[PDB]
């Protein structure tokens, strides 16, 4: 009806000329340069995702291309980043603080371009971090994003992935763009330990634990620099006022030891090889 008609007007009807799959729905790679195209069988959430990315292009954000659809079902074409996801790196390799810092910088820069444009991601995690072969870092999957306004600057709906969700979100309190900061802090734990806290627990158990403990403890804090140790706490602070911002954290001392983005290309190569080991 109405909402489908609005989406119909955004979608192009030109000339449309394989990752495999597939969660909601399936994602492929094709030839019409190398691209990535998703298929969903058919809503305002789709419209919001397409609009936010179409109207907020950035080198630190995976680039939108075009939109098509047959009868129902829908096609979103976007660029392809060949280095894969950060999840493949954090789960198969060890990152030094220099490499961990470099990633956080690119992510904080991607969060500063968003927070200043009244946009909260709300689903920051390593799975939603994609890598270029040159070690470039880009944010993806904005299906959970929420645009804020001068009149309404906060929200109260429970959205995101449990293990990366800030306490104020799981306790159904009002929150802002600093939930992307907590999620960044959890993603830093990924780059240290391989997993977010409580990953062995089921998602509901994790939520309960996040409400209880608040700030999560690292398995081996003594293996970290006092400057990295400081960066984490500035991300994982309970008080929203005390917790750092994308702009504020971009000027942190931990990001000065950031290695060149080229230093992430051996991590990528390792991830690629380890992805081959798991199959054979």
Q: How far is the CB of 228 from ligand 6BZ (least distance, A)?
A: 28
- Can you tell me which of 53, 103, 206, 249 binds ligand 6BZ, judged by CB under 6 A? 53
Number of C-beta neighbours around residue 168 at 10 A? 19
Q: What share of the chain is helix, strand, coil (3-state, %, to 5)?
A: 45, 15, 40
Only segment of 8-16, 43-51, 95-103, 205-213 that touches ligand 6BZ (CB under 6 A): 43-51
Q: How far is the CB of 261 from ligand 6BZ (least distance, A)?
A: 17
Helix axes of 97-115 and 179-193: crossing angle, nearest 10 degrees: 160
16 binds ligand 6BZ (CB under 6 A): no
Quick note: the x/- pattern for ligand 6BZ over 107-136, rule CB under 6 A, is -----------------------x------
Contact 141, 45 (CB under 8 A): no
* Distance separating alpha carbons of residues 25 and 39, to the nearest angstrom: 5
Nearest to 271, CA basis, from 28, 66, 90, 71:
90
Is the CB of 49 or the CB of 97 nearer to ligand 6BZ? 49
Q: 3-class DSSP state for residue 27?
A: strand
Sorted by sequence, the CB contacts under 8 Å of residue 167 that are 6+ apart come out as: 182, 210, 211, 214, 238
Only segment of 6-14, 32-40, 161-169, 170-178 that touches ligand 6BZ (CB under 6 A): 32-40
- Can you tell me which of 30, 56, 75, 84 binds ligand 6BZ, judged by CB under 6 A? 84
Q: Which residues bind ligand 6BZ (CB under 6 A)?
A: 19, 27, 36-38, 46, 49-50, 53, 62, 76, 78, 80-81, 84, 130, 140-141
């Amino acid at each position: 009806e109405e909402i489908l008609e609005k989406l119909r007007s955004i979608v192009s009807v030109g000339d449309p000329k394989k990752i495999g799959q597939g969660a909601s729905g399936t994602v492929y790679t094709a030839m019409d340069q190398e691209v990535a195209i998703k298929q969903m069988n058919l809503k305002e959430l789709i419209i919001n995702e397409i609009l936010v990315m179409r109207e907020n292009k950035n080198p630190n954000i995976v680039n939108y291309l075009d939109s098509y659809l047959v009868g129902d079902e829908l096609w979103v074409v976007m660029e392809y980043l060949a280095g894969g996801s950060l999840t493949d790196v954090v789960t198969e390799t060890c990152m030094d603080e220099g490499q961990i810092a470099a990633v956080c910088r690119e992510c904080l820069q991607a969060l500063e371009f968003l927070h200043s444009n009244q946009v909260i991601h709300r689903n920051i995690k390593s799975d939603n971090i994609l890598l270029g072969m040159d070690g470039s870092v880009k944010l993806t999957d904005f299906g959970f994003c929420a645009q804020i306004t001068p009149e309404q600057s906060k929200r109260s709906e429970m959205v995101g992935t449990p293990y990366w969700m800030a306490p104020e979100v799981v306790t159904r309190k009002a929150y802002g763009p600093k939930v992307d900061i907590w999620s960044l802090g959890i993603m830093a734990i990924e780059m240290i330990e391989g997993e977010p806290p409580y990953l062995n627990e089921n998602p509901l158990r994790a939520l309960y634990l996040i409400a209880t403990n608040g700030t999560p403890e690292l398995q081996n804090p003594e293996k970290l620099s006092a400057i990295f140790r400081d960066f984490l706490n500035r991300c994982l602070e309970m008080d929203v006022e005390k917790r750092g911002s994308a702009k504020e954290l971009l000027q942190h001392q931990f990001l000065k030891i950031a290695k060149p983005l080229s230093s992430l290309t051996p991590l990528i190569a390792a991830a690629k090889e380890a992805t081959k080991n798991n199959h054979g």
